[PDB]
Ligand binder design. Structure first.
Ligand SMILES: O=C([C@@H]1C[C@H](n2cc(-c3ccc(F)cc3)nn2)CN1C(=O)CCCc1ccccc1)N1CCCC1
Length: 710
């Protein structure tokens, strides 16, 4: 199978660092410089072996053709009203980027408002954030190039879709919030830095500030409204209250669901927005999350997890703000997580719950919190919503494993509410009735019951004969809920596969306690949970180790890379996308400092002792048993991934190829592909998505010798 040779890769045997008495050698530390001739030559040499391996077997073309056919279906966002007009996103099927449309009424002719496709030949300029002015007449939007997190903000007048001159640079991880007087907009920027700011650099991002841009002026005149010079990791995002009276500042440090909450009563400014605002430090610690829902005068409704790990709604009166005075509007549920809340039609709340990893949607009274109406849903996810306080209708978008889903609409001015199907598309080529989704709960090592969804063809025999594709993430309070993937359904239909998604700890599926169960000292629970999911699929006869592929991206790429090191005997194939691999150095680059809330940081002796045990870069070891080799492994990254800098995957593949690839018993390939004009994944054009999934499934097919089923 292996008709190539791994590239020679220099080992700097002098690269030795002491961590609290523990010496660590890092012979590929030089791969941390993305700009060097050495690193560029490494990337070229690696792509030179991977690409022919992926493209060789005809199965890639079969998969690509079917993906192109089946992914070509119309894709809509919810409609949403801003001022006098409605907007929605739409992709006719295979456009690289979805297009923003406008119409003057629901029954009215729609026209193109913003088409990002015309901004690049290859679809690599994408929308990243936007905000309409409160009256709907002006529009700010972020553009990112080549998949970087960096944003340039541009502006348009809505009537006539007129480009304006205003341009804001150095924007990253930014809010966008217009004052209701229509004068200007809050946003965040970083100070100037040496070197590049295009997504290929690794430079740490510190000292983010909050600015106010007056429409019709140069960025150099923007007002500095908040800064944290003694706290370089703090990030302050602004939003206006629904009545326009208050700027609410949510300060974050790290990725935990907590924030400080400061407010500025704009009417109390001495002369409008002229400098640092008169912040009132309502919640001046990082002990809980406070997510603004709405206010009525001084009574502010927040979604919180303060002593409520499944979340709840509280009212804080700014005139009586002591915690013992807060009113619990909607108490916490014993098991169900309150995922998000919106206020609509003045005095309604829309609450979206997660119940055993499936969404529900409810309408409640704002004054009392009482339940008024259940909006019924099939088993799946709510993935889009519109309906703000001044609006009188909601749209929401549902999706599931087997259907691209439905957009529903409900006119909330009606005495008797009845949600109605607004848009529904069906994918022909996949008959949903041929498949089933089951949810099971399996015990992990410590006995905890973990949910898992399994999707498969109805009537299969559980005789261990089927290829399986097992996905997980496990971190950052992210809940992995049902979603429609044509790419995975092609694996089911045309490769005879079984799909599985394990809701391992670290996620948000059972609230903040589920999250804390997969972080810091307990990060190993994630790996244990995921290995136990694989053991479940094997014991129950869905699959066998030689037929099992695991996949994860980002924090999920860490997941699958560590699982390869810890249990190589369990997996046939591992695909780690954009993964965090160097757990000792991740905090040094770009925004990696923010992840210390899930992982810890190697600067601490205690944290180092957790991290060293599972860090993928530091645990590559030949399996002791003669009959055990590493699984086939493919790492996917891209040269503008400034979220997880690609040195993680570069150093990891160098280590895999040297320690394991050189061994006589290793015949499974250990490969990387580094894409160009792409980053962590947000905004990736359709063309690149199709190539990526074709690479993934070709790798699986070749390594596991799976025949195509037409
Ligand atoms: O990018 C990240 C983390 C994960 C975190 N995240 C993503 C999602 C998500 C969920 C659903 C979905 F469809 C798409 C994305 N939810 N949380 C945002 N993150 C960051 O690093 C965010 C960086 C910016 C930041 C930092 C601190 C405070 C605020 C903002 N990581 C990369 C390596 C592992 C963590």
């Amino acid at each position: 199978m292996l008709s190539f040779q791994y590239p020679d890769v220099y080992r700097d045997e002098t690269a030795i660092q002491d961590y609290h008495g523990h010496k660590v050698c890092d012979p590929y530390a030089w791969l941390e410089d993305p700009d060097s001739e050495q690193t560029k030559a490494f990337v070229e040499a690696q792509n030179k072996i991977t690409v022919p391996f992926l493209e060789q077997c005809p199965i890639r073309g079969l998969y690509k053709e079917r993906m192109t056919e089946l992914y070509d279906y119309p894709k809509y966002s919810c409609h949403f009203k801003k001022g006098k007009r409605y907007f929605y996103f739409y992709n006719t099927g295979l456009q690289n980027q979805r297009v923003l449309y406008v119409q003057d009424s629901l029954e009215g002719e729609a026209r193109v408002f913003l088409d990002p496709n015309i901004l690049s030949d290859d679809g690599t300029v994408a929308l990243r954030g936007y905000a309409f002015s409160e009256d709907g007449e002006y529009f700010a939007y972020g553009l990112s190039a080549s998949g970087s997190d960096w944003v340039t903000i541009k502006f348009m007048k809505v009537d006539g879709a007129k480009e304006l001159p205003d341009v804001l640079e150095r924007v990253k991880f930014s809010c966008m919030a217009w004052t209701h007087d229509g004068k200007g907009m809050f946003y965040n920027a970083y100070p100037q830095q040496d070197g590049k700011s295009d997504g290929t650099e690794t430079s740490t991002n510190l000292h983010q500030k909050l600015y106010y841009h007056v429409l019709g002026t140069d960025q150099s005149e923007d007002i500095l409204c908040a800064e944290f010079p003694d706290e370089p990791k703090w990030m302050g995002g602004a939003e206006l209250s629904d009545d326009g009276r208050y700027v609410l500042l949510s300060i974050r440090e790290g990725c935990d669901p907590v924030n400080r909450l400061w407010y500025c009563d704009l009417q109390q400014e001495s002369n409008g927005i002229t400098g640092i605002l008169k912040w009132v430090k309502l919640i001046d610690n990082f002990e809980g999350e406070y997510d603004y829902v709405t206010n009525e005068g001084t009574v502010f409704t927040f979604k919180t997890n303060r002593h409520s790990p499944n979340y709840r709604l509280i009212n804080i009166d700014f005139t009586d703000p002591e915690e013992s005075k807060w009113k619990v509007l909607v108490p916490e549920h014993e098991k169900d997580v309150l995922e998000w809340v919106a206020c609509v039609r003045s005095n309604f709340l829309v609450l979206c719950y997660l119940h055993d990893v499936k969404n529900t949607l409810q309408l409640h009274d704002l004054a009392t919190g009482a339940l008024l109406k259940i909006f019924p849903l099939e088993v799946g996810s709510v993935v889009g919503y519109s309906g703000q306080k001044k609006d009188t209708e909601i749209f929401y978008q549902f999706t599931s494993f087997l259907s691209p889903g439905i957009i529903y609409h409900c006119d909330l001015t009606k005495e008797e509410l009845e949600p109605r199907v607004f848009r529904e598309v069906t994918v022909k080529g996949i008959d949903a009735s041929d498949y089933q989704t089951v949810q099971i709960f399996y015990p992990s090592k410590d006995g905890t019951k973990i949910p898992m969804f399994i999707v498969h063809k109805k009537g299969i025999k559980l005789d261990g004969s089927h290829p399986a594709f097992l996905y997980g993430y496990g971190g950052f309070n992210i809940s992995i809920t049902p979603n429609y993937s044509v790419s995975r359904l092609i694996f089911v239909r045309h490769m005879g596969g079984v799909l599985a998604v394990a809701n391992i700890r670290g996620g948000g599926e059972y609230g903040e306690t589920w999250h804390k169960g997969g972080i810091l000292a307990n990060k190993q629970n994630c790996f244990d949970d995921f290995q136990c999911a694989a053991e479940y699929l094997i014991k129950e006869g869905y699959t066998s180790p030689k037929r099992l592929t695991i996949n994860g991206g980002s924090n999920g790429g860490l997941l699958v890379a560590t699982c390869a090191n810890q249990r190589p005997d369990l997996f046939g194939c591992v695909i780690a996308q954009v993964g965090v691999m160097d757990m000792l150095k991740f905090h040094k680059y770009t925004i990696g400092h923010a992840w210390t809330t899930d992982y810890g940081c190697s600067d601490s002796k205690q944290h180092f002792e957790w991290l060293i045990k599972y860090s993928p870069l530091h645990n590559v070891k030949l399996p002791e048993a003669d009959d055990i080799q590493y699984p086939s492994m493919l790492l996917l990254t891209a040269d503008h991934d400034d979220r997880v800098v690609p040195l993680h995957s570069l150093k990891f593949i160098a280590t895999l190829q040297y320690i394991v690839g050189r061994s006589r018993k290793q015949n499974n390939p250990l490969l990387i592909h580094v894409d160009t004009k792409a980053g962590h994944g947000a905004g990736k054009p359709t063309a690149k998505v199709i190539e990526e999934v074709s690479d993934m499934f070709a790798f699986i097919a070749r390594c596991l010798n799976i025949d195509w089923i037409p």
